[PDB]
């Protein structure tokens, strides 16, 4: 019974892992559902496609690679299909997203006085709305997916609802 | 002497075209198109490049001997140059 | 002289020209499909070409730096 | 002028030369079996080469008409 | 005056590269690593462990460098025969079936090591997803 | 009255030389038909088969030479030349492995050498 229950708990753990990764692969069917509006004629020289700026902030006190994982593996096929020429503004310190968008608005204001957006993370959306309120008021579409010790394993097993949430939000952003 | 100079020039061009053909063909044949494990090419690629340039230089000598037997030249092959 | 300057400019011109020819051929081979289904330039390929010319220019710059690391040109 | 007429006389042979070279290469790609068994072409290959050069000239005139169609005359 | 010097430089490049060097450098490397592991083994024992690991390293790198000088290639199916003949030539002194099983186990181990070191330089894919 | 054995050779006592010699024989029997089959139809043969055939031939010949040298020059009696001739067998085996490797790459194979000597 020892080896029996050993291989039993081993095969139910590996079965849960394979079921989660199989469901993550299954959401690529709805990625293919987003490949269906891709096949549209762009013009030769004039049309440069719709740019979706994406602001990247790391999770607090750990590295950027977790937010880059949730960026790449889930969001980047969706923006690579349907031909949306994105751009990535990532930070390692704090405030770089904010000063980037504020310097963009400030440069637009300085140039005019010379004569969608998907930010990942609660910190990135905080710094982005601070950069908006600094650029518009100060001197000279939004989509918020949320990246995240046995709680890590509980999140790692309850993963299909999370990738369903992220993929459904970003297909709502692309299709609409 | 200009005539001996560009005779040597077209002879060096005939050497250079053959050398570039050997280089491109032994590049294509056994340097792997998939991936490179390291710079400073390994033992197998060194041995294959040696055997490729040996086979290729002998084949160039054999074909350059054979097309003179079969009379291949610019006058016998390039028929389209006779219009001009 | 004028003829020397014209030939020195013409070398740059046809260098850029053969770079453009190899660029067109490679970025046609890369993701523009050979199975011609519809007579359009697709929305996927219109960004493929942007990223392909950008990556080819970064490739030419990187190899031009790696030649100049060693003692050559 | 002299450079104009020599450029036209150069182009009128450069076109036919490159057409001959691409004709030889593509018709050797399409028809000739890579497994060599004899040094002479078969009766199938000798006909498919004639069909190859005929289809090549048809592709040339169709591509000329299509580039005159949507491309401007300049 | 310099002909013998440049010939000696070329000969030491050939002896360090073209498989005589491949055989003996990994042999003394396995000998030193077996002498290192003999500290844990004794905790004649260290000598036998150093002899065994020097044998393993020398015959693996020698059979690899002689298969790769053959066959004109640089791919896998190399290590699965190099480690196979290494396991055979090492556990040859006891049993034909034991030599076959030792060669098969060492071939699977060398194949796993080469699949770990090789599945990072394979090909940059069409998507980093 | 008996079906005794295949005629046994002077196998080394501690080593498993009999079983490995049997293995080399039984895998050398069908492998020699392959140059005979591929040479009857045409001139086609490929290396890494001539190399493996000559290497298995070398291992089998080394086993045969060790069996005849143990059969004829004893270990208990006259052992001074015996170790030297065993070392000359191993030196000949190593020089012949290098000859096989130089015959596969810089030349066209041992079976090609046999055919050019028969022609």
């Amino acid at each position: 019974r020892n080896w029996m229950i050993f291989w039993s708990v081993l095969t139910v753990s590996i079965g849960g892992i394979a079921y989660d990764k199989y469901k993550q692969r299954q959401i690529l069917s709805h990625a293919t559902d987003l490949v269906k509006p891709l096949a549209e004629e762009s013009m030769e020289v004039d049309k440069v496609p719709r740019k979706i700026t994406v602001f990247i902030a790391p999770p607090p006190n750990d590295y950027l690679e977790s937010s880059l994982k949730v960026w790449r593996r889930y969001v980047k096929p969706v923006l690579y299909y349907a031909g949306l020429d994105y751009e990535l503004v990532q930070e390692d310190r704090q405030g770089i997203i904010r000063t980037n968008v504020a310097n963009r608005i400030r440069e637009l204001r300085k140039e005019i006085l010379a004569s969608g957006v998907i930010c990942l993370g609660r910190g990135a959306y905080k710094e982005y709305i601070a950069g908006i309120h600094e650029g518009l008021l100060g001197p000279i579409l939004l989509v918020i997916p949320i990246p995240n010790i046995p709680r890590r394993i509980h999140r790692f097993y309850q993963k299909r609802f999370y990738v369903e949430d992220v993929c459904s939000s970003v297909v709502n952003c692309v299709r609409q | 002497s200009q005539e001996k100079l560009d005779v040597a020039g077209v002879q060096f061009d005939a050497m250079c075209s053959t050398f570039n053909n050997i280089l491109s063909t032994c590049l294509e044949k056994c340097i792997p198109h998939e991936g490179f494990g390291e710079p400073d090419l390994t033992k197998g690629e060194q041995c294959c490049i040696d055997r490729c340039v040996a086979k290729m230089h002998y084949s160039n000598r054999l074909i350059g001997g054979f097309v003179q037997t079969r009379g291949f030249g610019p006058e016998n092959q390039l028929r389209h140059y006779s219009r001009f | 002289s004028s003829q020397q300057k014209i030939q020195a400019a013409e070398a740059e011109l046809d260098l850029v020209t053969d770079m453009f020819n190899k660029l067109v051929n490679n970025c046609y081979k890369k993701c523009i499909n050979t199975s011609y289904s519809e007579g359009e330039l697709n929305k996927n390929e219109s960004s493929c070409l942007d990223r392909c010319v950008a990556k080819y220019f970064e490739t030419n710059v990187q190899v031009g730096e790696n030649m100049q690391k060693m003692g050559q040109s | 002028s002299s450079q104009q007429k020599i450029q036209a006389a150069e182009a009128e042979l450069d076109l036919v030369t490159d057409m001959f070279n691409k004709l030889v290469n593509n018709c050797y790609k399409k028809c000739i079996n890579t497994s060599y068994s004899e040094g002479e072409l078969n009766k199938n290959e000798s006909s498919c080469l004639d069909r190859c050069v005929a289809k090549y000239f048809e592709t040339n005139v169709q591509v000329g008409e299509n580039m005159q169609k949507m491309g401007q005359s300049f | 005056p310099e002909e013998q010097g440049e010939r000696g430089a070329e000969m030491i490049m050939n002896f360090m590269t073209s498989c005589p060097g491949k055989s003996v450098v990994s042999g003394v490397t396995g000998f030193a690593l077996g002498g290192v592991l003999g500290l844990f083994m004794a905790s004649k024992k260290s000598y036998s462990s150093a002899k065994n690991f020097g044998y393993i390293g020398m015959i693996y790198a020698g059979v690899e460098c002689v298969i790769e000088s053959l066959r004109a290639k640089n791919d896998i199916y190399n290590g699965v025969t190099a480690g196979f003949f290494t396991g055979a030539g090492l556990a040859y002194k006891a049993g034909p079936q034991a030599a076959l099983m030792g060669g098969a186990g060492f071939a699977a181990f060398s194949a796993a090591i080469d699949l770990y070191m090789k599945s990072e330089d394979g090909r940059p894919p069409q998507n980093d997803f | 009255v008996q079906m005794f054995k295949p005629p046994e050779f002077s196998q080394f006592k501690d080593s498993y030389q009999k079983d490995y010699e049997r293995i080399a024989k039984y895998t050398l029997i069908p492998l020699t038909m392959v140059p005979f089959y591929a040479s009857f139809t045409g001139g086609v043969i490929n290396p890494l088969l001539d190399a493996s055939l000559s290497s298995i031939f070398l291992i089998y010949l080394q086993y045969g030479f060790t069996s005849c040298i143990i059969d004829y020059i004893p270990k208990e009696k006259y052992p001074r030349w015996h170790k030297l001739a065993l070392y000359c067998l191993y030196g000949g085996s190593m020089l012949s492995l290098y000859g096989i490797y130089e015959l596969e790459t810089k030349n066209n194979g041992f079976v090609d050498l046999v055919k050019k000597l028969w022609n």
Partner: protein, 80 residues
């Protein structure tokens, strides 16, 4: 490269000559491309209408492709 300001005009003349020579080269390369890509059948001496349409699709796709890559080339070489 950098030369006299009076000699820019003959420079533009030889630029025009290089442009028309490269245009004829592009024409021949397009003929080679959709001879290679779309004419695999060799039973007749005339073109099938399916292979006709393809030579239509190759001509339009490669010429729009070449103009898009030429525009991106001018865009990328504007920086460097």
């Amino acid at each position: 490269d950098a030369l006299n300001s009076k000699e820019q005009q003959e420079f533009q003349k030889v630029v025009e000559q290089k442009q028309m020579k490269d245009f004829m080269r592009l024409y021949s390369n397009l003929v080679e491309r959709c001879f290679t890509d779309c004419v695999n059948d060799f039973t007749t001496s005339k073109l099938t209408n399916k292979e006709q349409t393809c030579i239509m699709k190759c001509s339009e796709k490669f010429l729009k492709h070449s103009e898009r890559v030429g525009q991106r080339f001018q865009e990328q070489n504007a920086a460097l």
